[PDB]
Amino acid sequence: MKKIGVILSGCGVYDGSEIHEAVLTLLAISRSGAQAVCFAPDKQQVDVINHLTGEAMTETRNVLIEAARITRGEIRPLAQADAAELDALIVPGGFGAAKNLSNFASLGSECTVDRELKALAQAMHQAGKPLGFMCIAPAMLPKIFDFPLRLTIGTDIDTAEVLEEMGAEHVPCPVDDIVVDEDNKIVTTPAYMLAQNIAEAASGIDKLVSRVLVLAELEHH
Amino acid sequence: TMKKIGVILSGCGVYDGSEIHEAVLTLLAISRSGAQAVCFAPDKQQVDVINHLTGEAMTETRNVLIEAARITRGEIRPLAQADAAELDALIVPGGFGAAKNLSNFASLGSECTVDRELKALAQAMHQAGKPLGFMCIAPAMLPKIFDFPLRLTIGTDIDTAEVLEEMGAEHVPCPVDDIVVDEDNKIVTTPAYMLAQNIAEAASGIDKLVSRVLVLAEL
């Protein structure tokens, strides 16, 4: 069984990890016979959004604490994630990827990625382990690596601009397909960036996980 | 295909409300099967708020509807607004919230009471021949929603099955990957994380459940 690191950033689209994307990722890892190993930074969320309204709430919530709901408690602090013990890494989407794993939501092209996440990501790439980012998560790639990468965030021209202006070759991509930077073993997929329903999102996420897993083995060599 | 399937959520997380895996997996099957999910949650304060990492209760409040909305990306409505006439079927994912917020089975066990609206909706549905699907611990409410005996499951846990039979129900032992159907009352049930060891297993049964509810939904 191969260990696939999964980085969560909260529990819900606006606040943290996109619940559909996260659960769909976990399902694929599981159907593909791999073992998911979930992590989340142990820190306070940037904000807490009422998912019914869209308005911010005057309360606090911890990223790790909340992410734990998605994993039924089977989750650990991002700090404890050791690249040597993981065969791959997947980062589901959700605005939390842009607020808690980085501040891309605020500084855009001038954003900063989470220390640990960046470190882990690099250690993985530096060891030839595959990486999978989806939805808005790919926006961090240009900040995690200095060299150009082939990635996607779907077809949104505006976001793709910001990514290319960050030193990245953006490749337009449909909901049901993925993009791979063969050389750096980095797979990405449009999730709810383009998805209209959960079935669509599952479509691409499955392809992403299968490819990350393929790249993971073939590297186990 | 396009048929409205009511989905009742009770919060966002195993201990606090709806089992996130079960809920999302239910939604995925409804969607892959070409049906349309219509989610509801009672607009009320959760019985408790549990730290899912620890297991301990938190000194804070959270609203069932507000939180359930996270699972549906905001596409959710108050349970009160659910009209049986507009739904072709009804599915109730598991999670302890089904035992705390949709009923108090977690406390009163055999002496529990189901949520007014949920019970009303559930009966209206059955009374109109619409199929019902309950999973994980959710089936424990059936004996309290209906007075007549029903064939259902909560898996294989002898202890819980006892409590259910002692509530006037014919419990049928069932594996993670299979479901049980009360042909006559069009009620399908499946052990989810009651027996599931991983999400794939859980998906296995939930898919069968949704497919059967959808099939029965064809009248």
UniProtKB/Swiss-Prot annotation, chain B:
Keywords: Lyase
GO biological process: isoprenoid biosynthetic process; positive regulation of isoprenoid metabolic process
Leading EC class: lyase
Catalytic activity: glyoxal + H2O = glycolate + H(+)
Gene Ontology annotations for the cellular component aspect, listed alphabetically: cytosol
Entry's Gene Ontology molecular function annotations: lyase activity
Catalytic-site annotation from UniProt: 136
EC nos: 4.2.1.-
Family stated for the protein in its record: Belongs to the peptidase C56 family.
NCBIfam families linked to this entry: PRK11780.1
Record's function text: Displays glyoxalase activity, catalyzing the conversion of glyoxal to glycolate. However, this apparent glyoxalase activity may reflect a protein deglycase activity, which could be the primary function of this protein like other DJ-1 superfamily members such as PARK7, YajL, YhbO and HchA. Is not able to use methylglyoxal as substrate.
Assembly and binders: Homodimer.
PANTHER family listed in its UniProt record: ES1 PROTEIN HOMOLOG, MITOCHONDRIAL, GLYOXALASE ELBB
Name this protein carries in UniProt: Glyoxalase ElbB
Organism whose genome encodes this protein: Escherichia coli (strain K12)
Taxonomic placement: Bacteria, Pseudomonadati, Pseudomonadota, Gammaproteobacteria, Enterobacterales
